[model samples]
Target: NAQAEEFKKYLETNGIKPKQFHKKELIFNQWDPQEYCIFLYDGITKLTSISENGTIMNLQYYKGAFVIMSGFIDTETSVGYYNLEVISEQATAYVIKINELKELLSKNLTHFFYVFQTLQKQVSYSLAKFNDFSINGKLGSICGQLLILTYVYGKETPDGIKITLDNLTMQELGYSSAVSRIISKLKQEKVIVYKNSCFYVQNLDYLKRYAPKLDEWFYLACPATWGKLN
Candidate 1:
C-alpha cells in the first residue's frame, strides 16, 4: 500500500520533490512556526489540537486525499503548532505548500471528499437518531437511504460490502402487524425479496443507478420506519 516509489514518479512527473518517513514518523516536527501546509498522497493522517489541559482534542481527519485544512495554523488564528498521525502504516502521500494547493485544486479531480463526508455524516447522524428508535423494518429503510445517496454521489466499487438480513422477525412495524408482515409488504411490492434464507435485493445498485423513486418507495414501502434526515 505504501506505493512510495510510484509516488516519487508522480511528484517527479509534476516537477516536485517527494519526502519519505518511516512508520509512525512525524510528517512534520516540533517547530512551533508556520510551515508549508501538507497534503495526502496515499494514507490516512489524523490531526489533534492540544486543549488547555494539555489533552488531545481531535479536530478532523483526511484519508486518501489532500490534508487540505489544519485549523491549528491559520494566520488569523496564529496558533501554528500541531501534530499528524499516519493512521495507515502502508500509505504514502505528498504534502504540498499551502499556496501551492490553489494551483493543484483546479487540476486534480476532487469530488471525493464531498461524497465521503456526506456518507459519514449521513450514516453517523442516522445511526445516532436511530439508536433511540426501535429497529423495525427501520434498518432496511436506513440502508435504503445509504443506497440512494451512494448511487447519486458515490463512485462505484466493483464489489461492495455484502449486507445480510436474516433471523429477523417481522413484528416490528407496530401494533398493527409483526415485522414479518412488513417484510411481506416490501416483498409484495418488489422492494425486497427473501429466498434461501436471504433477503436478496432484486438489483441493489438499482437504488442509485436507475430507480431513485425507490427512496419514496423505501419510505412508503415501510411507512412506520424512521425517515432519513442526517
Candidate 2:
C-alpha cells in the first residue's frame, strides 16, 4: 500500500499518466537497456515467458503492482524478458522510461532508494509463496498462492466474491496430483464450485479461513501445489 501510494505520487509529479489496455492487449515485451518500468494501477495482468521449445509458462501475476524490467535492476537470475498481457476486462498502468528514471537518479541519489524499494516491495508475492511452500508443505503453498491471486483478480458479486479460472487449471495452481485432491476437498466443503472452467467461490470467507489451517491438516490434507505450463 505504501508503494502504491508512492508510485502514484511519483507518476503525478513527473506528469506521467496511466494508460488503459483492452482485454488481451499487449502491454510490453522484450527488454532494452532503456525499457520502461511499469506500475499497474488497476486490473489483472499475467506475465508469461516462452522457452526455446515453445512451451509457455506463467512467469508472474500482477495487480496494482510495480514491475521493474530486468535491465532496470540488477539480478543474477537469467529468466530473461517476459510479456505482460491484460488478463482482466481492462488494465491500467503507468510507465517510467529509462531516461525519465535516470534523470531523477542523477538529480537525487535518494530517488533510487524509493525506486528499488517499490519494485521489491510490490513484487515479493512469488518469493512469499516460495518460502511458505518450503516451510510448511504443498497444501500451505497452494492456499497461499491462491489467496494472493484471489485478492488480485477477485470481484464482488451479488452472491459472493467471484474469480475466474478460465485459462487456469488446478495444475497451474500447484500441487500436481494434489491439485485434484484439494479441489475435491474444497468442493466437498462447499468452499468453491467449478463450472464452465471458472471457479465460483461459494464462501469466500470460509476459503480464507481454511487457508491458514492448510498446514494443520498435514498428512490428512490433500496436498496443494502450484506453478504450471500454459
Candidate 3:
C-alpha cells in the first residue's frame, strides 16, 4: 500500500533506517536478547519455535509491512521466544530501539494506536488458529493456514487465487506424514491445486467449508489491515 511508503518516510524522519535481509537469514533468534522493534517494509518472514525433543514448528508467517516485537514490552526481560527468519528473496525493515519506540509512542497517539491495533490483530489470529486446531483438528488447521496464505500472498485469477511463495512445503507448514493425505484429499476434491511449487485455490467457498469460523476471523488474518497510519 502507498501508506507504507508514508510510514517509511515517518520512520526515516525519526532517525530509523531501513536494512535489507536475504532469504534463510535469521533476523531475530530465540536465544538472543532483543533490543529493537522491527517494522517490516517488504518481503516475508516466518516465525518458528523449537520443542524440547528438537522438533521445529512453524508458528506463523508475516508478509508485507508489520511490526516485529520480539517479546512483551511491559516485561523485565526482552528475550525473543521464537525465531524470526526471512523466507522471501529479500526483505527490508526499519529497526529502532525499544526505548526509542517508546518515546515515539508517548508523543504520538497515532503511532501508539497503530502498535495496539497490530498487536491486537496478532492475538486474534493466534486465538483463531488455536480454535481451528482444537475444533477442526489437523485438517481444519491446515485449511485455516491456507486461508491465511491466500490473504497474504494470494493473486486473483479467473480460475482461483494463486498463492505465490517459495518453499511452502509440508515441513514449512509444520506437517509431515498427515499433510500428504490431507493435501491429496483436497486435490481429489478439486478444492486446491498444487502446481509449479505454488498453490492455486480452486474453490474458496469449498475451502471455507472445512474451516467454518475462518470467514469470521478472515479480516484479522489479512496483512492489509495491519499497521496502517491513515
Candidate 4:
C-alpha cells in the first residue's frame, strides 16, 4: 500500500554513492575471540568455529530475519566473535538489541510478513536495503564501499575515469539529509579523497577487491527466510 510506496519512494532518491562494496571478492581472517558480533542486515553469512585442536568446524548459518546481538552495545557489556560467511550472497538480517525481545515480540507478525514479502519482490529495495543498511546487508557496501568506490571515479583505477562526487546529488545516511554521513566517514578513513566536486581513490586494489563481495548478496532478491546460498 501507501506505506510500501512511501518506502519505495525513499529508495528512488537513493542508490549508490561514490564508494561502494560488491560481493566480487573478500578478505577473511580467523574469527575474533572477543565477544563482538556483527548483525546481518542483508545477505547470507556462515558461522564457523575453530577448535583448540587447530581444526575448523561449522557452528551455524544465519539467514533471513535473524539479528546479531552480541556486539558492543554500551559502556558495560560483553562481546564475542562469531565467524560468518555469505552462503548465498543474498542473506540479510538486522543488528538488534538482544534485550529488546519484548519489543520484538510485540510486533505484529502478519504485518511484518506482509512487508517482508512485498520488499522481497522489488527491482531494488529501499526498506530492506535501509533496514539492512541500518544493520548490515550483503549488497554493495557503499559506506563500506565508500572506502573503495572513491577510486573507481578517481584516477588510480584500471580505467582512468575521474568523476567528482560533489557534482552529483547524494542522500544523507541516517535521517534524510540528501547526503550520507557514510561518505563523510569514509572520506576520513583515508580511503577516499573528495575535492572539486569529485572523489578520488587513494588505493585502487583494496576498493576493487571489496566492491564485488558487497554486490553478490545485494542482488539475490530473495526473502523466503531459508533458501539456496549460492
Candidate 5:
C-alpha cells in the first residue's frame, strides 16, 4: 500500500489528479479511446467486454490497490480493449494519460519498478486461472476463483471468511447456471453460506478440497506478505 501511496505522490507532483467514481460507473469503455492508464487507489472494479454475439463477459474483478496498464502503453490501437466498471460504493483512482505516464516512468525508475511488479502479479494470476480451468474443470475453477476472492475481499469472522461481494456479482464471474448449481451444492454441504447478501465460508478446509493446488496459486496471485511491508 505504501508503494501505491508513493506512486500517488509522484502523480500529484506531476500534476495528475485523482478521480472518484460511484457504484456502476464506467471508468473505461472498450469503444472509447485508450488515452489513460488507471491506477486504482481504493475500492473495487470489474473488467468486462462485450462479445461479438452481444454477450457481456465479465473478465475479472480487482479490489483495493492495483494498476491497469495493459493495452494502454506502447500500443498502436487507440480503442480500449475492455470495459472497466466501478463496482464498489466508491472508487478512487489516478487517471494518467499514456504519454504522461511514459514520461513519468522515464523520469522515475522506482515508479516504473512498482508498475512492473504489479504487471508481474497480474500475469501470474492469469496463468493460475488458466491452470485452474485446465485441471479443475468448471466447478473446480469456481472454487479456485472463490479462494482468490476470499483473499481479495474476504473479512475474517467467528463463523468464517465473509466475502464482501454479493451473489449476483459472483455469478457474473462465471456462467450463472454453473455458478448457482455449484453454489447450491456448496451450501448444501455447509462449506459456504449466504446471508445478508454476502457469502461466508463456513468450512474453508472443505472448500479447499475442491482446489487443492489453490493455496500456492493464491500466494502467486496476491502475496500474503505484501501488506506487511512499509
Candidate 6:
C-alpha cells in the first residue's frame, strides 16, 4: 500500500498531465521513446504488433494501473518507437515527459525506489510469459495466458468469475481443436462456464486447481506490484 501511495503522490507532485482515450482509439502505433511515458490512470488497454508473417500478435492485455513502457524510461540506451494499441473504453492516463521523470526521480529517493521496483517486476513477468510460450504445453500456455487476463479483466459474478475481451478468441491462441477440447473439459468439469462472450470461472479456487503453476506466475501480491509491458 505504501509503495502504491507514494507512486501516486510522486505523479501528482510532478505535474502529471491527464489524457483521455476512447475505446478502440489508436494511442500510437509508433513514437520516439524520448517523447514521454504514459501512466495508466484508469481502465485497460490492449497491445499488438505485426509479426514476421504479417499476422498481428496480441502481445499485451493491460490493467487499469501501470505504465506503458515509454521505451528506455530512466534507462540509458536506444530510445525509439514500438507498435502498440488500445482496446478499452474511457481509458485515462498521466503523461510524464522524459525530463520531468528524471527530475522527479533525482529529487526523491523513495519515489525512485518504487519506480525501479515496478520496472523490474514488469520485465520479470514478461520474460516469464515468453518462456511459457516457448516451453510450456499448449493447454499450459493458454491457461497461463487466461490467468493473466483474469487479473486485469475478470469480473465477479453471482456464480463465477467472468472476463470479457473484445480482441480475443480461441483461434487467436492457435491450438486448433485443442482449444475447443480444453474448453469442453473445463466446462464439463464445472471448472469454468462460457456465456455472453465471456469465460466464467466457477471460482478462482477451482481455476487455480486447473492451472496451479500458471496461476502462481500470473499473480501479484499487491495491486501496484503489477504492470503491463507493451
Q: In order, what lDDT does every prediction score? A: 0.44, 0.59, 0.73, 0.39, 0.75, 0.62
Task: Report the lDDT of model 4 for residue 155.
Answer: 41
- Tens digits of per-residue lDDT, candidate 1, 109-227, equal 34334323434543554453344234334445444444543333233233332223212211111211344454566567665454544444444543333333444443443333313
Clashing pairs in 3: none
| TM-score of candidate 1 against the unseen true structure | 0.38
Q: After TM-score superposition, what is the CA distance of residue 161 in candidate 4 from its true location, in Å? A: 48
- Candidate 6 regions exceeding 4 Å error are 31-34, 51-54, 74-80, 149-158, 162-185, 195-198, 203-211, 218-220, 223-230
RMSD to the hidden true structure, all candidates? 12.7, 8.2, 4.2, 16.4, 3.5, 5.4
Between candidates 4 and 5, which one is better according to lDDT? 5
Clash-forming residue pairs, model 1: 41-93, 170-178, 170-179, 170-180, 171-178, 171-179, 172-179
User: How does candidate 3 fare on TM-score?
Assistant: 0.84
**What ranges in model 2 sit over 4 Å off?**
1-6, 31-34, 73-79, 105-114, 122-124, 135-138, 149-181, 193-230
Pick by TM-score: which candidate is best? 5
Q: How far in Å is the alpha carbon of 97 misplaced in model 1? A: 4.0
The true-versus-predicted C-alpha distance at residue 208 of model 6, in Å, is 3.3
Model 5 residue runs over 4 Å out of place are 70-72, 76-80, 164-176, 225-230
What lDDT does candidate 3 reach at residue 91?
A: 92
In terms of lDDT, which candidate is stronger, 2 or 5?
5
Instruction: In angstroms, give how far residue 206 of model 1 lies from its true place.
Output: 18
Candidate 5 C-alpha error for residue 41, in Å: 1.5
Query: Which sections of candidate 3 miss by over 4 Å?
Result: 166-171, 174-176, 220-230
lDDT of 2: 0.59
Residue-level lDDT tens digits of model 6 in 29-57: 55443455666757667676666697866
Alpha-carbon error at 110 in model 2, in Å? Answer: 7.9
**Ranking of predictions according to TM-score:** 5, 3, 6, 2, 1, 4
Supply the global lDDT for candidate 1.
Answer: 0.44
Q: Over 4 Å off in model 1, which ranges?
A: 1-11, 29-31, 69-81, 98-230
